[PDB]
Amino acid sequence: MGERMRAIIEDYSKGFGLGPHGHSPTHDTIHYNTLNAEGERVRDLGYTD
Amino acid sequence: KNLNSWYTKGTMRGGVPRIYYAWMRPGSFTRRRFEKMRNP
Amino acid sequence: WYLQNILSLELLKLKSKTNAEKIATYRSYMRSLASGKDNTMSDDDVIRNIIKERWKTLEFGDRNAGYPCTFGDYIQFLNEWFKSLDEEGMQRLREHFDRRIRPLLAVMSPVDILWLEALTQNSPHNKEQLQRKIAFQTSLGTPEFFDMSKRLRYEINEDYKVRDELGPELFALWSKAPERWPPERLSKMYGLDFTLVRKILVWHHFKACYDACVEPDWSLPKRLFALEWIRDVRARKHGLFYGKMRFAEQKITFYSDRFLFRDLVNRREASYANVWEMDDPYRFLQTEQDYEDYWGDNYDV
Amino acid sequence: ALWYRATEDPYFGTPQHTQRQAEALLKVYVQAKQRGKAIDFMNKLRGSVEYLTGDITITTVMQESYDALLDTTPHPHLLTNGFTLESDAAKYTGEVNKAPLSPLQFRIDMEMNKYRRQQKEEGVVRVPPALWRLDTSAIVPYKVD
Amino acid sequence: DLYPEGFQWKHKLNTEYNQWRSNTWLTPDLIPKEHRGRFLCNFQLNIV
Amino acid sequence: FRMSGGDMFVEYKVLSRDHRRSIRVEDAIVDPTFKRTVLPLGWLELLRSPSLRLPTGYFVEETVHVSLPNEANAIIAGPVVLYITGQSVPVVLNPYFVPEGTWDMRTRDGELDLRLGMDAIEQCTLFSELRPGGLLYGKLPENPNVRRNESLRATLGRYGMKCDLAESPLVPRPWTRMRYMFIDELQRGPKLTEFVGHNPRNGTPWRFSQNTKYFRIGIWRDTIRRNDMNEGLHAHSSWQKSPQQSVPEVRFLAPYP
Amino acid sequence: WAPQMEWGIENTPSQEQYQEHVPDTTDADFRKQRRIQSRPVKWFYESHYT
Amino acid sequence: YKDRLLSKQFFQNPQAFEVVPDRHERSVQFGGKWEYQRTHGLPTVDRNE
Amino acid sequence: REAFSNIIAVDLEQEGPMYPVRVNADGVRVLLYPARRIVANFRVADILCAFGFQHAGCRINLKATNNPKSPTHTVEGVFEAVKALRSVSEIAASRGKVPHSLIYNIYPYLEEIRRRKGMMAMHPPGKDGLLMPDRVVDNRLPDHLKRGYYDDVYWKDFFAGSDEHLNEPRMGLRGDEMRRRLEEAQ
Amino acid sequence: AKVYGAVPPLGAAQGHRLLHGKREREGSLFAVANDVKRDERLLRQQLNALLEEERMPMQARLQRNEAVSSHEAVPQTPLVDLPGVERRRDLPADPITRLFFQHKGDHALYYGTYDKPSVQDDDRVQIEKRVPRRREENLYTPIYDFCHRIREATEQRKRFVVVPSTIETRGCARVMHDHGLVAGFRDFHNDRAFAVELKYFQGDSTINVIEPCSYDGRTEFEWSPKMMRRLLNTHGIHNRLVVYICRTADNRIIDHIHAVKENIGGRGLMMVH
Amino acid sequence: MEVYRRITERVRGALWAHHGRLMSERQFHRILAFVYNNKYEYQIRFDRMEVVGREWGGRVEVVTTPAGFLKRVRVNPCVEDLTLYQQQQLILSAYANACADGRKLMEQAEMNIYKQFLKDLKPIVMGIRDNPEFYTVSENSIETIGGVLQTGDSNNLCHTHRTIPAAKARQPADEVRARQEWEQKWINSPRGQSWALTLRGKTYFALHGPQYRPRGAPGAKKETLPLDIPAPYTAMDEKRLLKKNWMAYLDNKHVAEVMWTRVKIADREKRQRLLQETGRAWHRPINEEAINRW
Amino acid sequence: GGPGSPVRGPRGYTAEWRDLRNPMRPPEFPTPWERKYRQYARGQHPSYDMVYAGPMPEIFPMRRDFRKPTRWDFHDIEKQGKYRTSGPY
Amino acid sequence: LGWTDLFTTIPDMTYHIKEWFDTTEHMHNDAVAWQLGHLLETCFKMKE
Amino acid sequence: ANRTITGNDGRFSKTIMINEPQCNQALSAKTASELSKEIDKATNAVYS
Numbered sequence A: 001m002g003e004r005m006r007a008i009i010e011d012y013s014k015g016f017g018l019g020p021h022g023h024s025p026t027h028d029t030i031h032y033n034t035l036n037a038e039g040e041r042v043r044d045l046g047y048t049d
Numbered sequence B: 001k002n003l004n005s006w007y008t009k010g011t012m013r014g015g016v017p018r019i020y021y022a023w024m025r026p027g028s029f030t031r032r033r034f035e036k037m038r039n040p
Numbered sequence C: 001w002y003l004q005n006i007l008s009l010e011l012l013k014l015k016s017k018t019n020a021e022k023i024a025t026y027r028s029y030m031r032s033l034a035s036g037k038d039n040t041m042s043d044d045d046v047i048r049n050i051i052k053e054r055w056k057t058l059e060f061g062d063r064n065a066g067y068p069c070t071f072g073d074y075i076q077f078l079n080e081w082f083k084s085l086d087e088e089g090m091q092r093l094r095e096h097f098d099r100r101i102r103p104l105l106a107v108m109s110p111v112d113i114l115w116l117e118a119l120t121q122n123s124p125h126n127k128e129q130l131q132r133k134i135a136f137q138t139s140l141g142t143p144e145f146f147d148m149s150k151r152l153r154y155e156i157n158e159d160y161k162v163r164d165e166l167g168p169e170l171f172a173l174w175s176k177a178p179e180r181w182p183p184e185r186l187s188k189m190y191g192l193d194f195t196l197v198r199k200i201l202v203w204h205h206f207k208a209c210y211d212a213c214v215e216p217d218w219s220l221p222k223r224l225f226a227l228e229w230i231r232d233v234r235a236r237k238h239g240l241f242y243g244k245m246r247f248a249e250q251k252i253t254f255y256s257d258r259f260l261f262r263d264l265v266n267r268r269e270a271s272y273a274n275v276w277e278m279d280d281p282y283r284f285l286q287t288e289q290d291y292e293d294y295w296g297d298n299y300d301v
Numbered sequence D: 001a002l003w004y005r006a007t008e009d010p011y012f013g014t015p016q017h018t019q020r021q022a023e024a025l026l027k028v029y030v031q032a033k034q035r036g037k038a039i040d041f042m043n044k045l046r047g048s049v050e051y052l053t054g055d056i057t058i059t060t061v062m063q064e065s066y067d068a069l070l071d072t073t074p075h076p077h078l079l080t081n082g083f084t085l086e087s088d089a090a091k092y093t094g095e096v097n098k099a100p101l102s103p104l105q106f107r108i109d110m111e112m113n114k115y116r117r118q119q120k121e122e123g124v125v126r127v128p129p130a131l132w133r134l135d136t137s138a139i140v141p142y143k144v145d
Numbered sequence E: 001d002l003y004p005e006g007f008q009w010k011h012k013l014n015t016e017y018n019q020w021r022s023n024t025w026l027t028p029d030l031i032p033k034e035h036r037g038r039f040l041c042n043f044q045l046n047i048v
Numbered sequence F: 001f002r003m004s005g006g007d008m009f010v011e012y013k014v015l016s017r018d019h020r021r022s023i024r025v026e027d028a029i030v031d032p033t034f035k036r037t038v039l040p041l042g043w044l045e046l047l048r049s050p051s052l053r054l055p056t057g058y059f060v061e062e063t064v065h066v067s068l069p070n071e072a073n074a075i076i077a078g079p080v081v082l083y084i085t086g087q088s089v090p091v092v093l094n095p096y097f098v099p100e101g102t103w104d105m106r107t108r109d110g111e112l113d114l115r116l117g118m119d120a121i122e123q124c125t126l127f128s129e130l131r132p133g134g135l136l137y138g139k140l141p142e143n144p145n146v147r148r149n150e151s152l153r154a155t156l157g158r159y160g161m162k163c164d165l166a167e168s169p170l171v172p173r174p175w176t177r178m179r180y181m182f183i184d185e186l187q188r189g190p191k192l193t194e195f196v197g198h199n200p201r202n203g204t205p206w207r208f209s210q211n212t213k214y215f216r217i218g219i220w221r222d223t224i225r226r227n228d229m230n231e232g233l234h235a236h237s238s239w240q241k242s243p244q245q246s247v248p249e250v251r252f253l254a255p256y257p
Numbered sequence G: 001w002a003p004q005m006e007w008g009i010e011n012t013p014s015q016e017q018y019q020e021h022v023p024d025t026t027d028a029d030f031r032k033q034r035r036i037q038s039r040p041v042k043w044f045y046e047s048h049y050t
Numbered sequence H: 001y002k003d004r005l006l007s008k009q010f011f012q013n014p015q016a017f018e019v020v021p022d023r024h025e026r027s028v029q030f031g032g033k034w035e036y037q038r039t040h041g042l043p044t045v046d047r048n049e
Numbered sequence I: 001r002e003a004f005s006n007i008i009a010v011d012l013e014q015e016g017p018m019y020p021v022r023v024n025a026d027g028v029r030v031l032l033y034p035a036r037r038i039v040a041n042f043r044v045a046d047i048l049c050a051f052g053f054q055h056a057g058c059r060i061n062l063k064a065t066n067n068p069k070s071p072t073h074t075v076e077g078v079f080e081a082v083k084a085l086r087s088v089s090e091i092a093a094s095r096g097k098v099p100h101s102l103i104y105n106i107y108p109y110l111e112e113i114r115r116r117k118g119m120m121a122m123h124p125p126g127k128d129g130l131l132m133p134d135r136v137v138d139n140r141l142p143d144h145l146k147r148g149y150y151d152d153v154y155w156k157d158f159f160a161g162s163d164e165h166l167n168e169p170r171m172g173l174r175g176d177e178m179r180r181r182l183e184e185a186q
Numbered sequence J: 001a002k003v004y005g006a007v008p009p010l011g012a013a014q015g016h017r018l019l020h021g022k023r024e025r026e027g028s029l030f031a032v033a034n035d036v037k038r039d040e041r042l043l044r045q046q047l048n049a050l051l052e053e054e055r056m057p058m059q060a061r062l063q064r065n066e067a068v069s070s071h072e073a074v075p076q077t078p079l080v081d082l083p084g085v086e087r088r089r090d091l092p093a094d095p096i097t098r099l100f101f102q103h104k105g106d107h108a109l110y111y112g113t114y115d116k117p118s119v120q121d122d123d124r125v126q127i128e129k130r131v132p133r134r135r136e137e138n139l140y141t142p143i144y145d146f147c148h149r150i151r152e153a154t155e156q157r158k159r160f161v162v163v164p165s166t167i168e169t170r171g172c173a174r175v176m177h178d179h180g181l182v183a184g185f186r187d188f189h190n191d192r193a194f195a196v197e198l199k200y201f202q203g204d205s206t207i208n209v210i211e212p213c214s215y216d217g218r219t220e221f222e223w224s225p226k227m228m229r230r231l232l233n234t235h236g237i238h239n240r241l242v243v244y245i246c247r248t249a250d251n252r253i254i255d256h257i258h259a260v261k262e263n264i265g266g267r268g269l270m271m272v273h
Numbered sequence K: 001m002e003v004y005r006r007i008t009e010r011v012r013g014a015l016w017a018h019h020g021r022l023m024s025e026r027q028f029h030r031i032l033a034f035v036y037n038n039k040y041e042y043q044i045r046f047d048r049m050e051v052v053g054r055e056w057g058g059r060v061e062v063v064t065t066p067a068g069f070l071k072r073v074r075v076n077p078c079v080e081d082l083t084l085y086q087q088q089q090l091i092l093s094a095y096a097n098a099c100a101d102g103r104k105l106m107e108q109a110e111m112n113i114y115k116q117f118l119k120d121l122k123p124i125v126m127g128i129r130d131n132p133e134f135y136t137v138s139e140n141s142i143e144t145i146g147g148v149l150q151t152g153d154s155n156n157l158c159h160t161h162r163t164i165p166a167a168k169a170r171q172p173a174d175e176v177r178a179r180q181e182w183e184q185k186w187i188n189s190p191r192g193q194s195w196a197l198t199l200r201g202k203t204y205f206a207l208h209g210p211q212y213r214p215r216g217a218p219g220a221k222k223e224t225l226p227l228d229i230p231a232p233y234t235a236m237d238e239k240r241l242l243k244k245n246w247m248a249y250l251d252n253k254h255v256a257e258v259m260w261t262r263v264k265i266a267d268r269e270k271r272q273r274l275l276q277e278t279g280r281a282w283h284r285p286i287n288e289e290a291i292n293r294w
Numbered sequence L: 001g002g003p004g005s006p007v008r009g010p011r012g013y014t015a016e017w018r019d020l021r022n023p024m025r026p027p028e029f030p031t032p033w034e035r036k037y038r039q040y041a042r043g044q045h046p047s048y049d050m051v052y053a054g055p056m057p058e059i060f061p062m063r064r065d066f067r068k069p070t071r072w073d074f075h076d077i078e079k080q081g082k083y084r085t086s087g088p089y
Numbered sequence M: 001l002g003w004t005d006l007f008t009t010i011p012d013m014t015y016h017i018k019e020w021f022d023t024t025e026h027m028h029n030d031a032v033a034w035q036l037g038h039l040l041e042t043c044f045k046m047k048e
Numbered sequence N: 001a002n003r004t005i006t007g008n009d010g011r012f013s014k015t016i017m018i019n020e021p022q023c024n025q026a027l028s029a030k031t032a033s034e035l036s037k038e039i040d041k042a043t044n045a046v047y048s
């Protein structure tokens, strides 16, 4: 039950298109959001006018 | 010129059924992983 | 009973919609916005549900008691009607049977026999013991798992539905000059493999014909599949048998990688005066042996 | 089968169907009390090439035998000439004398079915004008010897 | 096709497919872990 | 197939039997006043291809009076295949080969005035053009059976046509004749095909039912101790433990179940 | 078209097919799974090319 | 076209065209067993147009 | 469970071995060869039937009287043999070659090679099919602007309960429908 | 009524024999008899011609079509060329990493035989001829130990085998490489030996079994065309799976498939699959 | 084939990227099928005509259908004296200049096809960008889990273009209705009355009146309002799939996503090449922080 | 007639040089060959062989084959006796 | 000059291409595209 | 036939090698017309 749960979730929640480094989220050698490096980048910035 | 007929080839085992394939093996039937593009 | 319940629509009353309901329904139908209520059920679907449950709630018996029909009465009407069938009548019948009953005939199971007899309200020999057995065994799964209504629900390849292929494609064209429309022009329409799309084209032609009340070309399946036809003829003559050749009986020859080169440069360099010459149906045939295998079926030709 | 073999056979076969063959087959259908086949055959014949060439013709004998069997065998929707009344059908019908179908009621139910059909197909029906009345004047009832 | 795709439908669980199409579901002790929910078939037992 | 001046013009391709040799004809009248199609005698030698099955080019070569177009003034030669542009089916003539003197159709410059007779009309879709309402119906030779000037619905009306197609609620509408179409690959998958007998073609698809002698002890042991595995031939039966029974045309590649 | 093949059910006479004498009646052979037989002359009603 | 079509449809079955339909059953056919070759499909439009 | 651990399968595309398999289990020499039908010792035979073989035939230890012979040996032999069998497809890939049976698949390819002459081979002059973005486009609007924006094209209050298409999902709603939301909330 | 391919319309003034029908000449029984015989054998001759065109192999047909294609009216003399372009080139090999040096064909005078080899490829060990130590022992053949070299080198999963070089041995190699049972092979024009490169797939070899036909040189097996034709047939299905190699009277090393094609019988060498 | 399928995949992908709509495989293939059949028609009609290539002087003539088929060859007896080799080359070069002329024709034809195709895509494409919710950000602006970051440089260089009038909607339909309003206004005027009796007027009525087409004559018999398929407002293939089987849903959305990604990659490759051609970009990665530092 | 049969045996230009003619030059009597055949005769016609044929599909599915009563299907174990029934049929 | 995209320093590249495409499995152009592409990126493009 | 051009085929890969070390790999008319054959017969192969 859990496995097909996970499969559905990971398949529906996956991203697509090209990121800031010009590549797919699933691309082989090059990665995005390493160690929640973007998460922190939102932490310290925040969204406000 | 091939006198064995494919029409009669086999041995009746009486009640024992066996499967046969119309064309290919059933596992090779639905190719959807290349069709719908699920592959690594 | 059949006249009142099924055939007479005019006596069927539907629950009247409020004004709010009318509006929400209208604006749902005209423009879809996501997250909405998925139901929005067409009064067509609703109506057909009411009818099918009228078939559910139909029970036989003494009609001085509650129910409408003697069982004998029912099979009597049934018998008068089955004798009464024309050619296309019993054709419609057998189609109806192949579509509904036959798949059920494949998915049945002892677990259903009680339910299977609940359709006619007939009483079984073992009824108490079947009660117990089936209770214990239906215990082992979901109630949705076990009801025969839902066992046919999914179908592979959802991109092309049989419902949508009922209207045949571009029928207003290849009707009028079927020669200018070889299987290729239409085959670009489907994202399926070769055998499947030719199969489908055959079905299109037949549906179209029956729709226009004319008889279909029965030579068409032989024409589209011509290569398969001749391969089967020559196989039948080789291994001596009647039927269709299957995989086990194919030659075990192993061709080289580049085996197709000669034919490849022959095809790549071909040229044709018109497009009819390009694909005529008979380009498969050169020698007299070819023409003798292709038409052996019609004793006319 | 014999009728196909008549033109299929190289040795004993005729190039086109002779009239003899036609009226023979029709006579088999009459003598089999076989209705549907008689009708379809008659129409197919008058649609053949031999008919249009003038080679095969429908005669008065074929015609009247055709009509004979068309009368004397059961019709699907209607009572037919050569249907025998049953005294005891009053158990159900309610009457001893008359025929157990009324053409007027049959017509009416045909109208009803016409509207039920237009509804089943288009989901909606056009209400007939106020000047519209079903013309029953052309209907006559069953007469019985 | 050396390594054919085989049976790919996930609409039920492996154990529900197994349950419906196989007697093997009734004898959970007689089957190893790698084959547990994997069989759609009925097996005959012959004691030599 | 095109229309002008009141009659049909069809392109066709004449061919020897082995299809070694061929001739195109662009505009030919379709005329059903010719019992048999006529060609110029000169083509007889052009179309003669002496194959193995026909050591001489043709199966039939004789002389006929052939005075119908215009004592042996012509030659019946068979069989020469004929492909008309509209039709999918070849039509096989045994035509009259006529010399110049018997009949000369040079009629207009470069134009050979060829026409097609009922020899070839009987074999095509063209034949349906011969029935009342069609485009050749005007040109049929006069008969008792064919009325010249009648309106179509008048004629068919005599044959018993009353209303338009499926106009009366009593006759089912033509397009509901075929509602569902069965294609294994698009729905529910392929069948599970077994056999009991010598081959797939020599046996029945059916296994033997529960009532067999040899299956009864087994099925018993299987009903009583349901959970343990049981020896027997009772496996080969159509009946078994699992909810999915073995009967023909089980769709085993279907997603559900 | 399928040629007629020897050693079939309706072909083979009794003693080879079964080791017993089985009566030949034109009505209802249970062993041969037929309901009834009208017994026309074999090649008469069928087409010759068949 | 409507007339060529009408006629073909009528000689297919006449019982489609009757107000009260008689029994419609298939009988033999005069062209042969292969008669469909000379019959089938829909009326064809002239190719020039 | 030891037998389910050791399960073997067989490719039945070929329905029986297409070459002889000569293989020995411990002390038991087995031959699995192609035959017109199934020929084998009764036990070996319904073992080969358990796989669904029509055309196989098989022999254990030359003469049937040859040692060692046990029921164990009889079973282990034929199973060992079958486990050594190579499918034809596998053999064909093994040599880097195309099987005669699979060539039909190339046909449509080869077909539109033939048919590619003329216009079908032609590509539009100037146009690659790859169109790069140049400018930036945003049509988004403040809510009050889109409140009556589609009234003429469609009905008024077009975006009403639309959560994705509005910053205020509840605007334009008549009281009833507003009450519905809370009604399902509690 | 426009006509294409029919050349001048109505042909030219040609009546048929039966139609024109000049009065039949009365020949003495001599004339008639001779007419019957010459036109009978004229038909016979024609039937022959057609059968020969039907049975012509594709290669023959292609050579014919492209021979006619280049045909000119005068039979032109060959043109004088460079001192030579036509020396068969030497097959490429690397000098530095080598099984053996590729020896030039220009040295063809230097070469020895399989029995008495000329000194070459000194840096490599030299394979020895395998001969019986006593009477009862089998008499070995280069084919026998060719097959066993390959078999054993396949069992140890080696990439290269050094193997005896004789006519039918490297014949066998070319045939196996045709069928793809072997990755490659080369003869370096080394007298004793040449080298074969083995192919593995899915972890085991491409060769199930490889066996010589004869154990001795004193026994020679002859293969009738019908036998080689039996091999090809597995109960009605055509089987090329297994390969059999053989000599021809023509000194060719052939598989059984080409042999059956041209219906020649040959002497057996080995089976492999 | 290629140029088309690229654009169609662009459309399908974009359709799912911007709004949650899926295009039915049925539809996607039937677009392409229509292009194909267009080409086929152009072929049918192209074979009725001939193109003549000519080599030296006029003394080698080659008559060939534009598809490259060869029908006739005329030759001077001069040529007959050359060599078989040179005869061959001569005829072959004439054939080549024939194929050239034919191919020029065909390429105009193909340009025409491309235009019709675009015109047929326009209600879909302009279906997705003409909504009040559609937007894009510049490709060089960083994207982070919350939303998209602002590109810093040249605050003049970023201009946001807007396709939609921000006040009450004026749709293409209103424009077509405006066009027929002006048609009728012109016709019903006195000067227009006199114009409708000219040759220009009757040319206009023969081409662009459908209303007067006799029953059974080919072509549309009414004037059609331009198709409206607003993308976010019309549920297409995702709702049917979501009702029927989740698995096909996930697979089809996966296909759309993959296609979109692929398209985007192509656009990146073209951009890279155009960047290298003009020398702003090197031939191997010289800046690895633009990649590895995420 | 094959390889076992008795052997058949065997500057300017010969008489076989003249009969030959270029396919480039228009031949003697302009016999209307079908283009397809001359294509096939010189070996340049695209081949359609039995190798290019896939499976022959079931198009119109036959009928349900209903279970035909055999002698081994009987509701009493008695009717299949050893003294009566030696097999299903 | 951008005449070509690809450059390599690896000995006997040809052997490695051979043995790499031996280990590859399918013919579907998805597979082919990736196999070829991965070959190119890992060797012939100069990333490192 | 001239041993001018040689080759090495893996399962899915193909190696065409020009061998003319004497004239410094300068192709003749025959050898070039040959190479345009081996190249497109290698390239139009099914498994390459």
Ligand SMILES: [Mg+2]
Pocket: C262, C263, J058, L043, L044
């Ligand atoms: Mg060839």
Ligand SMILES: [Mg+2]
Pocket: I065
């Ligand atoms: Mg002993």
